[PDB]
Design a protein around this ligand. Structure first.
Ligand SMILES: O=C1NC(=S)N[C@@]12O[C@H](CO)[C@@H](O)[C@H](O)[C@H]2O
Ligand SMILES: O=C1NC(=S)N[C@@]12O[C@H](CO)[C@@H](O)[C@H](O)[C@H]2O
Ligand SMILES: *Cc1c(COP(=O)(O)O)cnc(C)c1O
Ligand SMILES: *Cc1c(COP(=O)(O)O)cnc(C)c1O
Lengths: 830, 830
């Protein structure tokens, strides 16, 4: 059937009875009233059973051996569905397929019932998810720590061409994967005030919110390692949230508990954008405060909570603990670690600071200013008074270091300060992270260089040793084997299966680049993938597409910097050229654009409307026929990504040079047989460098060009004046060609494009359509297109998150990855 | 070990492995980190397993045979713990005891970990719970329908002698007994307006709240019948509760979902008191609206949703459905049934009315005016506009009936109206229930007569056939076998086990009233019970009591009508007599008073403080010694009741004649070997009539006396003037004898007692202490005390809820109870 494992005789039988056990005893249903949803659950529980044994021994294992622990703190974990991934990592896929088949059910139909765990916004959240999979696969004692939002990223609905947001109640039917651990609930404090008494400061009169943990298993790939992802949920204490007496109402006091519990209610739907709301800051401290107590408790046990030097010496803390900050969201971990160490454990400042810097490491994910976290001082002052005091003290000592290093450089002092003066004082969380971490890294080579050369230049000059790079990656398990079994199979037929956990081995595919059979196969799976997607489209969304055309897709969050608008200009151009010469042949294309716009992002929502507006005209023009279709992919998410990416021919990574930190969707397309048209931005540079620029469709300005243009001054009118095709498009938008009933509907887009385009869309227009012509030319030559595809796939190995993780482990955490199978799952009950 | 069933070889082995299965796979724990709470859960899941098989076949059974269904609607179900009760009804108690013993665990210690399901206030809620147990034991196709509050009756804490309330988060660690059924979610409407168009009225522009059901199994006693209790939970829709667009905030819209979900958040803690809050009315309509759609859906299937006459003829509705209204809380079921039948199904009014009256039956639980539900018209008008219109129409036609029957009687017309004029117009829900039900019943003989003679006199004259009586009862399973196995054993040694489901057989115990062995045994178990309770007291609450003294206990909600104050007067009297003649012998007593006060009930909270105030003085007076102890039993609830009742010697049922509808605690004490000192009120009359007045300690005014006194006019001063002992007590309270630091602390109590005592405490004082002297005299004669006890126990059979239910079944619902074992639980998987 494929190498989804063995369909053993004993195990298919065992699976079936356990499926029936759960359908009866767990779901309390009988075959005569069971619905597909019940069947999905019976299966999920049956599969979950297989990893609890391993989960228990893995955790027990870490307790006995006591290795250095890695704590990955993030406010986002974009997991997606977990049934198939678990089967894949446990080699249960074929057995389960066989078993459900014999039970007369279609496993694929049941897999579609699982809701996505959309606890993330996009790239930052999905990276964390890929990282977790890689850390388990590499046998690291790693824990993912975050917030269990009851409402994840909103479900997107397109009404009248407009995006409609609706709550993502992913827990509505329950989550069979998580395990509530009420017994490990911890208290978190807010507000209060600081008392300075005799031997130390005291954080007093605080409001308490409880943090209840929920653990989700994270299985490594076929190594019997099952790590843990711990998500915190907010709960109101039953005392003060009722006991602070003297009138108000008993009923009201109980109803008001949903005020402390609102902290973990919903994920902020912002991508690459900072919103300074109090609820956000509470979420940030909540995850940090709870996570740190858990980390220290585990440390106090270790082998110190037995003997060792005997005396809670936190000198060994950094030798046993490593905490990675996924962006600045969990940045309060630095002043919170100091608070505990200094205020509670009573360590002297300097010893505490040495420990803190040695265990903390910070990763930066963006350079756009509006994405930078700068919290107003009055907020921190009210919500976290002691922390503000600690931050000021950290700043005081840091600036003293600067002054000593750069005597007289008074401007450098204000530039490097963690405290920004002006309208309202703010705290620059990024500066905080750099100061309190022993390592700072970018997520792609060019992005990391940009941090050193621009944004954190002064910091780099002070401590050059801190700055590093760790190019992002993606897990080959979910992003190949899971979503593209057909491609994984033909690759395995030639080079084996060892590449799933050693992607570098894909290079061996280079020697089949002239193989006639392979070329035919690679081309066949892509065709099968496009037919399946073309079907799914009419199935769930309804209104036909042509599977023979070129599948041109750009899927990612909607942003001005991602330039979906530039893609739009090209689409309208294609349309205008066809209308000019109807009977001329052009390569048919189906351009698919999908992505969510943050609810408050007006321009991004305007762009979604433009896209659907273009589709309304283009898709109903009889002269165009099936040569050009414009489709907006609704509710783009992880599960949807697993469907489109394997079916794409052309991957659009067209951000303005210097704005996309790395990108990861680009890597997903490369591994799945799509060719890339893009700018020299983020990881695109390393991808073209790995495949060879001849096998990549690069165009537009490089970072240097963008700067040259900024010195000069960007004037969009120039481009409008010298390019008739561009002018024609702008006048079409301006006059209502795409919005008849509302002729001025797109005035904001045109106005912006002509007067305030921060991402110089027009500057890359000419080179973009010229480059698009080259891809069309190559598509007309199936054999050569596929051969270039093989060059990309065979050369994507470097982009596996196993490589990224191995580098974090060795260069930042100080731990050695291992591909050693943990001693089977075998029963055991001590 | 006792007759808690057989400890079979095969089953103890089977139990142990399943216990281990759950500890591992369900709790994901290993013996080395499992805590007593984990063990309790492993056991609960193992026990729960045994009844899912029976649950499925019982429900399937009702589907095939299609009998008339009984729907018990109540806003309260006071269930308590469910582990032991389930073991008892499944004959699993000894096997489980043995198995956990071999696993090295103490089953009793684990049972204490289970949280009480306190979804009720007291008697009304516990009756529903007893009823459910009896309906299953009698093989009736009955369903309990209510609300799944996430916070039940508050946990009571005594601080400085004052009651402190704290949220009852009973779901904090999860509920292993319930089964969420998200697939059966239903929509409920609120607000909106009424449109009158061509062919009928339309309820329009309503706000929708979803009702999600949770099913809890209700096992019958050893008959393999497992009925269902369906509790509704409020959920916000994900559309409009986000989709009603045009600014407000996406985050805020999501956070505001906890506004529609607040409907099922907390139980109103009022006992015998009406609070007209909008949240309460929403709860009432919520349970009714959801329950009715479920009932009709089930009906539409039956054997009509196949063939029969073919044409949804609701003429057979009352032949297949019976809905019992537990008080007026679910009274909107009447106008809601009409709404659906008339507005949706399009039945003519009269056919709809005939159907409604024939399926609805109403039970009244109180006669005090402040407990009567009278909803302001402006509330119904805003929240349920169509229902108000239906109520007015029902009223119009009803009053026409009255006028025709009593021509010219204009005052009778306004007295009987469902609409009360005055300050604000209100709707008298009780009048509504009587008009739309084919049966109205009281809960004890005297209470039922009072309804006919007083409160509903006019209604009784109009339709005498509607009024009936159904004296309350208690389940012998939980209230004997479960809480008092020792007594159940010795009874079974002589007369067998058939009495557990046929309590009348207890009469056979009369012939052992002179048996020397039995007298010694009955006295021995009571002594063992008192020693266990005396221990529990120091264990969990700490500060010693004497197990040789007479256990004088009054446990029930705190109310002026229950007269805990009268009990207090007696206690202070005993104390004053001892201080007068220290060296005189008196029978030692431990008087225990426990009960919760509604949070807003100031006087009731003042009484709790008085009780603890008396204990402060009495318990620390060296002259008193161990002859008198005053103890306030904290957080009185079902699980606590199961501990005190079996250990009591004297049961206090001293309400003012005519105020306690029935009472059920009185019945619990009688069955467990306590003697009763009380008034001729509620079921006390039938109890003394069953045991013989010679074996009962009756005192005080009868109903007639109370009325005579009211004609005359009640003047407390008279009693104060003629009784020195009473005067002395009042002057002790007034002067601060019981409240040194705050001498005027009890001015409200004294003021009330002297000028506004609605329950004439002083009028029964003399006869009360005189009667108390008689019980003390009899206690001095162990042999005769125990013989009188045997007379009570042997004669309590009539008070089993199996008797009550059998009467409701035959005289109201029209169904025949059956003690036929359902065809085993045996596997089966069709
Ligand atoms: O997706 C992202 N959202 C933010 S904010 N930063 C992001 O992080 C990802 C993971 O490092 C990068 O791949 C994206 O380029 C970057 O925009
Ligand atoms: O306990 C009760 N609370 C209210 S209100 N009415 C009650 O109902 C019980 C069940 O019928 C009766 O036993 C009580 O006498 C009555 O007060
Ligand atoms: C991989 C992924 C992303 C990141 O895509 P980019 O193109 O780097 O912005 C966002 N959303 C989902 C659903 C993804 O799978
Ligand atoms: C039986 C019971 C009641 C009712 O007691 P009465 O004395 O009739 O008021 C109230 N609360 C609990 C906990 C009960 O078990």
């Amino acid at each position: 059937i494929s190498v989804r494992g063995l369909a053993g005789v004993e195990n298919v039988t065992e699976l079936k009875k356990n499926f029936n056990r759960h359908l009866h005893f767990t779901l309390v249903k009988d075959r005569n009233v069971a619905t597909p949803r019940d069947y999905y659950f019976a299966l999920a529980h049956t599969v979950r059973d297989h990893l609890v044994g391993r989960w228990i021994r893995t955790q027990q294992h870490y307790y006995e051996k006591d290795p250095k622990r890695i704590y990955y703190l993030s406010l986002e974990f974009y997991m997606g569905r977990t049934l198939q991934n678990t089967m894949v990592n446990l080699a249960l896929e074929n057995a389960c397929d066989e078993a459900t088949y014999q039970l007369g059910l279609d496993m694929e139909e049941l897999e579609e019932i699982e809701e996505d765990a959309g606890l993330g916004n996009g790239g930052l959240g999905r990276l964390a998810a890929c990282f977790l999979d890689s850390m388990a696969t590499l046998g690291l004692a790693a824990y993912g720590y975050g917030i269990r939002y009851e409402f994840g990223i909103f479900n997107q609905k397109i009404c009248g061409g407009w995006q409609m947001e609706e709550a993502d109640d992913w827990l509505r039917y329950g989550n069979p994967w998580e395990k509530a651990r009420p017994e490990f609930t911890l208290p978190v404090h807010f507000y209060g005030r600081v008392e300075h008494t005799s031997q130390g400061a005291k954080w007093v009169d605080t409001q308490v919110v409880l943090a209840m943990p929920y653990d989700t298993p994270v299985p490594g790939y076929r190594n019997n390692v099952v790590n843990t992802m711990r998500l915190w949920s907010a709960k109101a204490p039953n005392d003060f949230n009722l006991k602070d007496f003297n009138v108000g109402g008993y009923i009201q006091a109980v109803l008001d508990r949903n005020l402390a519990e609102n902290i973990s209610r919903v994920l902020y739907p912002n991508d690459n954008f900072f919103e300074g709301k109090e609820l956000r800051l509470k979420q940030e401290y909540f995850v940090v405060a709870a996570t740190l107590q858990d980390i220290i408790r585990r440390f106090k046990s270790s082998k110190f909570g037995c003997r060792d030097p005997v005396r809670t010496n936190f000198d060994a803390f950094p030798d046993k603990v490593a905490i990675q900050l996924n962006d600045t969201h969990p940045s309060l971990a630095i002043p919170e670690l100091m608070r505990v160490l200094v205020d509670l454990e009573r360590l002297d400042w300097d010893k505490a600071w040495e420990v803190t810097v040695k265990t903390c490491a910070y990763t930066n994910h963006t350079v756009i200013p509006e994405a930078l976290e700068r919290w107003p001082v009055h907020l921190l002052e009210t919500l976290l008074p002691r922390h503000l005091q600690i931050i000021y003290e950290i700043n005081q000592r840091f600036l003293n270091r600067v002054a000593a290093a750069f005597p007289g450089d008074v401007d450098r002092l204000r530039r490097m300060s963690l405290v920004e003066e002006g309208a309202v004082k703010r705290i620059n969380m990024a500066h905080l992270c750099i100061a309190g971490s022993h390592a700072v890294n970018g997520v792609a080579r060019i992005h990391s260089e940009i941090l050193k050369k621009t944004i954190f230049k002064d910091f780099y000059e002070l401590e050059p040793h801190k700055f590093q790079n760790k190019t992002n990656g993606i897990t080959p398990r979910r992003w190949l084997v899971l979503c593209n079994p057909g491609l994984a199979e033909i690759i395995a037929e030639r080079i084996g299966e060892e590449y799933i956990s050693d992607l570098d081995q894909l290079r061996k595919l280079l020697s089949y680049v002239d193989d006639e059979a392979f070329i035919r196969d690679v081309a066949k799976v892509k065709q099968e993938n496009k037919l399946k997607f073309a079907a799914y489209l009419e199935r769930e969304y309804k209104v036909h597409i042509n599977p023979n055309s070129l599948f041109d897709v750009q899927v990612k969050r909607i942003h001005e910097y991602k330039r979906q608008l530039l893609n739009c200009l090209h689409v309208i151009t294609l349309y205008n050229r066809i209308k000019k010469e109807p009977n001329k042949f052009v390569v048919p294309r189906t351009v698919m654009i999908g992505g969510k716009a943050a609810p408050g992002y007006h321009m991004a929502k305007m762009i979604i409307k433009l896209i659907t507006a273009i589709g309304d005209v283009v898709n109903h023009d009889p002269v165009v026929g099936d040569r050009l279709r414009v489709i907006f992919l609704e509710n783009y998410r992880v599960s949807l990504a697993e469907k489109v990416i394997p079916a794409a021919d052309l991957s659009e990574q067209i951000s303005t040079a210097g704005t996309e930190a790395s990108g990861t969707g680009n890597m997903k397309f490369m591994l799945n047989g799509a060719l890339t048209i893009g700018t020299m931005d983020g990881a695109n540079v390393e991808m073209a460098e790995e495949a060879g620029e001849e096998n990549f469709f690069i165009f537009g300005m490089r970072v240097e060009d963008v700067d040259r243009l900024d010195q000069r001054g960007y004037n969009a009118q120039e481009y409008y004046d010298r390019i008739p095709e561009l002018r024609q498009i702008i006048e079409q938008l301006s006059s209502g060609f795409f919005s008849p009933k509302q002729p001025d509907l797109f005035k904001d887009i045109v106005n912006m494009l002509m007067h305030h385009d921060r991402f110089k869309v027009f500057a890359d227009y000419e080179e973009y359509v010229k480059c698009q012509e080259r891809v069309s030319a190559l598509y007309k030559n199936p054999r050569e297109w596929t051969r270039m595809v093989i060059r990309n796939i065979a050369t994507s190995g470097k982009f596996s998150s196993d490589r990224t993780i191995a580098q974090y482990a060795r260069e930042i955490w100080g731990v050695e990855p291992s591909r050693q199978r943990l001693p089977a799952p075998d029963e055991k009950i001590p």
